Design an enzyme around this catalytic site. Structure first.
Site, short mmCIF file in Angstrom:
data_model
loop_
_atom_site.label_atom_id
_atom_site.label_comp_id
_atom_site.label_asym_id
_atom_site.label_seq_id
_atom_site.Cartn_x
_atom_site.Cartn_y
_atom_site.Cartn_z
N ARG A 36 0.85 -1.21 0.00
CA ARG A 36 0.00 0.00 0.00
C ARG A 36 0.88 1.26 0.00
NH1 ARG A 36 2.49 2.00 3.30
NH2 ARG A 36 2.34 1.94 5.59
N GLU A 42 -1.24 10.45 7.74
CA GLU A 42 -0.11 9.74 8.38
C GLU A 42 -0.18 9.91 9.90
OE1 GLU A 42 1.74 8.67 5.03
OE2 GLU A 42 0.99 7.04 6.74
N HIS A 43 0.11 8.82 10.59
CA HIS A 43 0.14 8.69 12.06
C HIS A 43 -1.19 9.21 12.62
CE1 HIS A 43 4.28 7.16 12.50
NE2 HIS A 43 4.58 7.93 11.43
N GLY A 135 10.64 -4.16 4.02
CA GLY A 135 11.00 -3.06 4.93
C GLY A 135 11.15 -1.74 4.21
N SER A 139 4.21 -1.60 3.35
CA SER A 139 3.47 -2.64 4.13
C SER A 139 3.70 -4.06 3.55
CB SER A 139 2.01 -2.28 4.21
OG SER A 139 1.82 -0.90 4.62
N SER A 140 4.94 -4.45 3.38
CA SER A 140 5.28 -5.85 3.01
C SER A 140 4.65 -6.76 4.07
CB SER A 140 6.75 -6.07 2.89
OG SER A 140 7.41 -5.58 4.04
N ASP A 185 -2.89 -0.59 7.27
CA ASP A 185 -2.12 -1.38 6.27
C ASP A 185 -2.93 -2.65 6.00
OD1 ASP A 185 -0.61 0.80 6.64
OD2 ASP A 185 1.21 -0.27 7.47
N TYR A 235 8.44 4.75 16.60
CA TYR A 235 6.99 4.55 16.32
C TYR A 235 6.26 4.36 17.65
CZ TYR A 235 2.64 2.80 14.14
OH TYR A 235 1.34 2.58 13.80
O1 HFK Z 1 13.20 -6.70 9.36
C1 HFK Z 1 12.20 -6.04 9.13
C2 HFK Z 1 11.88 -4.77 9.91
C3 HFK Z 1 11.14 -3.81 9.00
C4 HFK Z 1 9.80 -4.36 8.56
C5 HFK Z 1 9.94 -5.75 7.95
C6 HFK Z 1 11.23 -6.49 8.07
C7 HFK Z 1 11.44 -7.84 7.37
C8 HFK Z 1 11.23 -9.11 8.26
C9 HFK Z 1 11.72 -10.44 7.71
C10 HFK Z 1 13.03 -10.34 6.94
C11 HFK Z 1 12.93 -9.28 5.85
C12 HFK Z 1 12.67 -7.90 6.45
N1 HFK Z 1 10.25 -8.29 6.58
C13 HFK Z 1 9.04 -7.47 6.43
N2 HFK Z 1 7.89 -7.85 5.64
C14 HFK Z 1 7.89 -9.04 4.85
N3 HFK Z 1 7.00 -9.26 3.82
C15 HFK Z 1 7.35 -10.48 3.26
C16 HFK Z 1 6.79 -11.22 2.17
C17 HFK Z 1 7.37 -12.46 1.80
C18 HFK Z 1 8.49 -12.96 2.47
C19 HFK Z 1 9.03 -12.23 3.53
C20 HFK Z 1 8.46 -10.98 3.94
O2 HFK Z 1 8.81 -10.06 4.95
N4 HFK Z 1 8.91 -6.24 7.12
O1 GAL Z 2 0.79 6.51 8.98
C1 GAL Z 2 1.57 5.74 9.89
C2 GAL Z 2 1.39 4.26 9.60
O2 GAL Z 2 2.61 3.59 9.85
C3 GAL Z 2 2.44 2.31 9.25
O3 GAL Z 2 3.67 1.90 8.77
C4 GAL Z 2 1.74 1.45 10.29
O4 GAL Z 2 1.69 0.04 10.00
C5 GAL Z 2 0.30 2.06 10.23
O5 GAL Z 2 -0.57 1.48 11.20
C6 GAL Z 2 0.33 3.57 10.45
O6 GAL Z 2 0.54 3.85 11.86
#
Ligand code: HFK
Ligand code: GAL
Length: 388
Positions: A36, A42-43, A135, A139-140, A185, A235
């Site tokens: 997304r 935001e926030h 990351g 929103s992965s 998200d 956060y």
């Molecule tokens: O380390 C952080 C902190 C920041 C937020 C965040 C991460 C990590 C956590 C796992 C290792 C990679 C980075 N992954 C995600 N999302 C996510 N979506 C995925 C879809 C398919 C496979 C794996 C996936 O990981 N978000």
């Molecule tokens: O707009 C800030 C946003 O931060 C995102 O990354 C979080 O997952 C949401 O819930 C919202 O707080």
């Protein structure tokens, strides 16, 4: 220039080959859930406020089949995932409950299984793929939470609401990733519709699907390819000081307080505190204006409220970073631009004229100190299912 194409037929195709390779059979099911961009608001989600996100063609796909042995078998092929790329575990029971740990990407799937409301939940084999930059601020983790949830519904249909499923995915994020997110998200990844933004009232959980058709208008998302330490850490702190203001002002949320009400309340709060509330309280109003600006089809206009968002996030909420400030400068010469998501790195979102770019992307790349990646985002569908 360096525009990353959504490659969604390719992404499903890859997941399916990797499935047949790994498990010795064709998977029975495919699901997807998007990442997304938040256009504005935001926030605000955890301040029971308003957000105006849309869903991306960037997505997470599970391909998989039920098992009869009551255990879960996962392979991920997404390049940035922490090792190992495989994990197996028994389904949780009244005795044994799933626990966060190693690898981290598995915690999202574990969380969702652990809080799945319906039964009986059988075991399953699944390949996990994602074109959501891991990351990167799109929103992965919500796409993988909602993709998992969507797969669990095919194994054991829930009789739930869109909000109950969002809360499940949200609890997985709190308990299993230690990330105390609001509901935005998860909501957009569930409820997104091609050619629409989704105006969410995080007080009432009433949602509007706002047509974003006009093909004259593009949304450029630019990945700063940066994540500052302060992200994970700051956060929760912002969230905690939003509670303190609400506490002091007798307000059950910052939704219920009004800019005139807090102006008169400068005495009763920190300078940090007042600055965070003038963003939130402010940032609610402008999302309402933006909403009502989209509807009226004025695309220059809520430039102001978008750029206004950025200024306030950067000067008042203090959750921008020099990289985000400067991608904005680079682009803002385009209706508008601002940081998107939680901040301290990740992506900006720029509302330009489709024709304008790829001059925006010759120019951003050649005037951004870091590494820019681009997505030209069509507003996308939310969670989807395709029987195989
Ligand atoms: O380390 C952080 C902190 C920041 C937020 C965040 C991460 C990590 C956590 C796992 C290792 C990679 C980075 N992954 C995600 N999302 C996510 N979506 C995925 C879809 C398919 C496979 C794996 C996936 O990981 N978000
Ligand atoms: O707009 C800030 C946003 O931060 C995102 O990354 C979080 O997952 C949401 O819930 C919202 O707080």
């Amino acid at each position: 220039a360096a525009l990353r194409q959504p490659q969604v037929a390719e992404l499903l195709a890859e997941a399916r080959r990797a499935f047949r390779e790994e498990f010795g059979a064709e998977p029975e099911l495919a699901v997807s859930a998007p990442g997304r961009v938040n256009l504005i608001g935001e926030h605000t989600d955890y301040n029971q406020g308003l957000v105006l996100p849309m869903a991306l063609e960037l997505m997470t796909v599970l391909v998989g089949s039920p098992r009869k042995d009551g255990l879960v078998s996962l392979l991920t092929t997404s390049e940035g995932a922490d090792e190992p790329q495989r994990l197996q575990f028994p389904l949780p029971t009244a005795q044994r409950s799933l626990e966060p740990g190693t690898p981290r990407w598995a915690n999202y799937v574990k969380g969702v299984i652990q809080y799945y409301p319906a039964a009986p939940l059988p075991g399953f084999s699944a390949v996990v793929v994602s074109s959501v930059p891991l990351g990167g601020g799109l929103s992965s983790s919500a796409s993988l939470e909602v993709a998992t949830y969507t797969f669990l519904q095919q194994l054991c249909p829930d009789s739930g609401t869109i909000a109950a499923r969002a809360q499940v995915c949200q609890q997985a994020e709190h308990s299993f990733a230690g990330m105390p997110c609001g509901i935005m998200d998860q909501f957009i990844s569930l409820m997104g519709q091609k050619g629409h933004a989704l105006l969410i009232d995080c007080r009432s959980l009433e949602t509007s699907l706002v047509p974003l058709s006009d093909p004259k208008l593009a949304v450029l998302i630019t990945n700063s390819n940066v994540r500052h330490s302060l992200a994970s850490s700051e956060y929760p702190v912002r969230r905690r000081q939003c509670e303190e203001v609400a506490r002091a002002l007798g307000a059950a949320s910052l939704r219920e307080v009004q800019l005139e009400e807090l102006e008169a309340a400068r005495d009763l709060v920190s300078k940090e505190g007042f600055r965070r509330a003038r963003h939130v309280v402010g940032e609610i109003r402008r999302t309402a204006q933006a909403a009502a600006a989209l509807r009226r089809g004025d695309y220059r206009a809520f430039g102001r409220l978008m750029v206004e968002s950025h200024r306030s996030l950067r000067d008042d909420y203090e959750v921008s970073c020099p990289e985000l400030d400067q991608l904005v400068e680079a682009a803002l010469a385009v209706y508008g631009s601002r940081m998107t998501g939680g901040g301290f790195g990740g992506c900006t979102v720029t509302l330009l004229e489709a024709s304008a770019a790829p001059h925006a992307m010759r120019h951003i790349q050649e005037h951004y100190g870091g590494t820019a990646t681009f997505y030209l985002s069509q507003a996308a569908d939310g969670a989807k299912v395709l029987c195989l």
